[PDB]
């Protein structure tokens, strides 16, 4: 492979094929910080990896999550395989950068930006010739490298499915970071909408295509004598009797602008009706302009 | 006692974060006897992420809050129970969209729907020795309190009691679902940890409803 | 497995181990309709499956997407393996219900609600004894069953990674349906927000914790003589000069209600009654400014 | 002349839905010579979905529209190009949050970030025979037009003409990335399909800018 060869030409500068020493390994405090920085990605990755292990066990393999700097954050899988790798220097905190352990999927995934497998003597370091590694980089909410999913097994036990597995897990974890961020974005829009409702002069009531009140501000609650906090999520037809004008406009999905109307004891207001036309159906905002 | 406010729901979930922290060892210990020894660890991973997210969403509606929660539980707990507790909360979320308060009948409906979701997803039956062995009587407890027009605080105290009995009732059941059922007859004599989780939740809801 | 044995008891009622015939296979128009209503899950599933294949080839195996009724919607993988499964009746539109083909992961996954693998003589039908199947069900945006991901291969070539692979792919397609629905939810809230802004009486301008204008309605844009479409997404500092009263409050994150204020728009003085609404979030403070009509 | 509006962006993406439908068999044919014969089919599959979503979001801001578009391409195209075109649109979307209109300087910034996004994710260099062999000159073209203060429609005609020459220039290149590079020297003499896609996009943007 030109990937492997090109990687060897980077290693040939500073490294020998037969050497192997004690790991470069994040330790005590500084590892606690890396761990904490990676919380969001880590917890998602650990659940996914535990699951992958369960539907796969028994088998001689190990699963790693690594951060963007190729530091091992978490390991799981076969106890004996995990011990064999621990003895080679792969623990929590061990850095697996190309400039340390040689050409290996553990780093080559992030360097190439894709799913990669290395086996046997593809590995720059002889210590690794008894091993296969599969790895896939994973990405942010915002598309930057955030870590790597890897699978390690004795070279003679490797399977055709190992690589697509790491890929599919990295993509699962990526997308899960994305859904966390969509929910935050939707929360920020709700902050906008709630702050507008609370501060504006108009009274407001809006309901769903199914008939349910989605929001009502203090102002509309006072005037239409509704319960300012148990009205929301309830049918608008259960909450108040709508004047004939509105009632017909509603039936037709037809806007009203600054129209006069009277509600039910009797209240006279100048309203606006604003239909919202969506694929799921029609919703309404009704505003009560302050006389 | 006519209703449960959303601020009560938030305080409920905060209290669940605390209980899954302090009872972590115990739940894992229950899970060591009959599973793979992780259930407390995992509920704590899930619920601490839940409680982390809560301040940002505490001013919002019940449906959105339960949706965030179930979504978080869904992807961060793992194993058999994560998808289950997830589904519970997601179903509950879809019944309470835009709500800021729930009457006792509405409370029963939410739990009814969540329970239906967990049954329909895991296929468990009365006697299978799972969390559904607590969900079903809890739902039946809440329906009864709903008919008798009990206050929310008293109703929840009663579901909380039923939930305790129901979890204890799992001890003599042989497991027919999940990892426990690998053990065959050897699962008898040991309390189900998912069931004990549901109990912890009902106990904390009961407390939240006083405040 | 009790799961298999139980499945065998259901199959025992109506079905024999040695029989095999022509498939029950959706057809022409009814198929086109099934394919059409499964579009959202399908297109996501087919991309994911193409990718799983790419990093797995060469290998004697096939990958299937099935709808919630065990109907095969799409197949890909190794040409030869696909022709062998096709010889047994598995094509686009073939139903693989337990009541038709017997105990098999293709159905048992959805029946059990979980990732499942059946091999060799765990299968009810003898015709399947040469095959291994793995399958996992997948779920909606709203939590119900919507389909199944499966991997088929000669029994002697099964690998330990086959099952977790279908599981991870089912979960990925699931979550992608959820992300489509989250984006649609936010669009619906934006509709609420936009409709409020277009139909209300107050003028409104709103900006970021970063200083960038997020929204402005027609009413605010005429009054403050700002460009109605080019202002949004630009620094508010380079849009208009803010009065002393606002400047203070804005630095102090302190609200203002129905207060008097004098503005400047490209060398010109505007008088108005305003409200300033801070929005306090983990990432910083945002603002809403309302211009009340006099 | 002075700016690109969001309506023009929407009309752009609509026209990309059309071009990826009519040019499908062509793009696939380019991909047959040097790949797995699927690029037209996959671009059509993704862009068809994009244009399906677009009426619901067409009244929104440019950032939100590009973000839906990118998110859609990201999971529905597949292979090497899906993640790349998705990254392009996602990066563009983060630069244009809340925008309803972009000046030529801004349009250039948008494409710049877009392209940096695709280079960063795919690690492609000049002469590697990929879509970046069109994106890099396209961005350089918009930068020159911005300096010279050209109108948006003339700027976009220039970048479109440049996109064409840059796609043509891929023909004599040996592939060093993606599926084509498996063929070694045998990829010489055949136009790159990803690069042809970028060209199509630029031609359609040029048309949308007239309207
Ligand atoms: N099909 C099922 N239906 C309902 N509950 C289940 C099912 N399978 C497992 N459970 C519940 O999940 C609990 C185990 O949870 P946990 O240890 O978190 O996951 P795992 O067993 O996969 O490690 C069991 O005690 C049981 O209550
Ligand atoms: N690393 C990369 N950077 C940029 N573009 C790439 C890269 N790898 C592949 N491509 C582009 O993808 C195109 C092929 O896309 P497509 O056929 O959709 O995916 P695949 O090759 O996976 O089937 C190529 O013509 C090339 O332009
Ligand atoms: Mg367990
Ligand atoms: Mg477990
Ligand atoms: Mg291709
Ligand atoms: Mg392909």
Describe the protein in words:
Chain A is of the alpha+beta class and 291 residues long. Chain A folds into 2 domains: 178 residues, GAF domain (Beta-Lactamase); 91 residues, 2-Layer Sandwich (Beta-Lactamase). Chain A has 10 helices and 10 strands. In chain A, the strands form 2 sheets. Chain A has a 5-stranded antiparallel β-sheet with strand order 2-1-5-4-3, sandwiched between helices. A 5-stranded antiparallel β-sheet of chain A has the order 7-6-10-9-8. In chain A, β8 and β9 form a beta hairpin. In chain A, α3 crosses α7. The longest helix of chain A is centred in the middle third of the chain and has 38 residues. Chain A is rod-shaped, with a radius of gyration of 30 Å. By secondary structure, chain B is mostly helical. Chain B has a single domain, classed as DhaL domain (Serine Threonine Protein Phosphatase 5, Tetratricopeptide repeat). Chain B is 69% helix and 3% strand. Chain B is built from 9 helices and 2 strands. Chain B has a two-stranded antiparallel ribbon. In chain B, α4 packs antiparallel against α5 and α7 packs antiparallel against α8. Chains A and C meet through α3, α7, β9 and β10 of A and α3, α7, β9 and β10 of C. It is classed as transferase/transcription regulator. Keywords: helix rotation, PAS, transcriptional regulation complex, Transferase-Transcription Regulator complex. It forms a tetrameric assembly. The entry is titled "Crystal Structure of the E.coli DhaR(N)-DhaL complex". Chains A, C are PTS-dependent dihydroxyacetone kinase operon regulatory protein. Organism of A, C: Escherichia coli.
């Amino acid at each position: 492979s030109p990937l492997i060869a090109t990687s060897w030409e980077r290693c040939n500068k500073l490294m020998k094929r037969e050497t192997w020493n004690v790991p470069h390994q994040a330790q005590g405090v500084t590892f606690a910080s890396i761990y904490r920085r990676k919380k969001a990605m880590l917890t998602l990755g650990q659940a996914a990896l535990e699951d992958a292990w369960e539907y796969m066990a028994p088998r001689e393999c190990a699963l790693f999550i690594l951060d963007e700097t190729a530091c091992i954050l978490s390991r799981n899988g076969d106890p004996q395989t995990l011990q064999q790798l621990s003895a080679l220097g792969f623990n929590d905190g061990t850095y697996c950068a190309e400039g340390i352990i040689g050409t290996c999927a553990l780093s080559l995934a992030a360097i190439s930006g894709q799913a990669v497998k290395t086996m046997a003597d593809q590995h720059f370091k002889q210590v690794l010739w008894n091993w296969a590694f599969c790895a896939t980089p994973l990405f942010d909410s915002k598309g930057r490298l955030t870590g790597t999913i890897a699978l390690a097994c004795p070279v003679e036990q490797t399977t055709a499915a190992d690589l697509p597995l790491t890929l599919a897990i990295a993509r699962e974890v990526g997308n899960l970071l994305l859904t966390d961020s969509l929910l935050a974005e939707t929360n920020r829009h709700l902050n906008q909408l709630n702050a507008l409702l609370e501060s504006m002069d108009d009274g407001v009531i809006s309901w769903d295509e199914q008939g349910n009140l989605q929001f009502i501000n203090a102002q509309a609650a006072r005037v239409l004598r509704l319960d300012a906090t148990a009205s929301q999520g309830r049918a608008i037809t259960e909450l108040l009797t709508l004047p004939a004008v509105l009632q017909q406009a509603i039936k037709q999905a037809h806007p009203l602008k600054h129209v006069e109307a009277t509600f039910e004891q009797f209240i006279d207001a100048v309203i606006t009706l604003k239909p919202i036309i969506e694929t799921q159906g029609t919703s309404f905002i009704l505003l009560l302009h302050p006389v | 006692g006519s209703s449960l406010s959303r601020t009560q729901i938030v305080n409920w979930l905060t209290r669940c974060g605390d209980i899954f922290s302090t009872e972590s060892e115990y739940l894992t210990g229950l899970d060591r006897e009959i599973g793979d020894a992780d259930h407390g660890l995992n509920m704590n991973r899930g619920f601490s992420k839940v409680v982390e997210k809560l301040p940002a969403i505490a001013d919002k509606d019940i449906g959105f809050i339960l949706k965030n929660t179930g979504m978080t539980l869904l992807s961060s707990v793992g194993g058999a129970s994560g998808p289950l507790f997830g589904t519970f909360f997601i179903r509950a979320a879809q019944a309470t969209q835009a709500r800021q308060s729930l009457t006792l009948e509405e409370l029963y409906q939410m739990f009814r729907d969540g329970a239906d979701g967990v049954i329909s997803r895991g296929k468990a039956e009365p006697g299978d020795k799972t969390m559904c062995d607590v969900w079903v009587p809890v739902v039946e407890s809440l329906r009864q309190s709903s008919e008798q027009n009990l206050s929310v605080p008293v109703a929840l105290e009663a579901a909380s009691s039923i939930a305790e009995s129901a979890a204890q009732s799992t001890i003599t059941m042989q497991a027919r679902k999940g990892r426990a059922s690998y053990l065959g007859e050897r699962s008898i004599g040991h309390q189900d940890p998912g069931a004990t989780s549901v109990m912890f939740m009902m106990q904390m809801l009961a407390l939240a409803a006083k405040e």
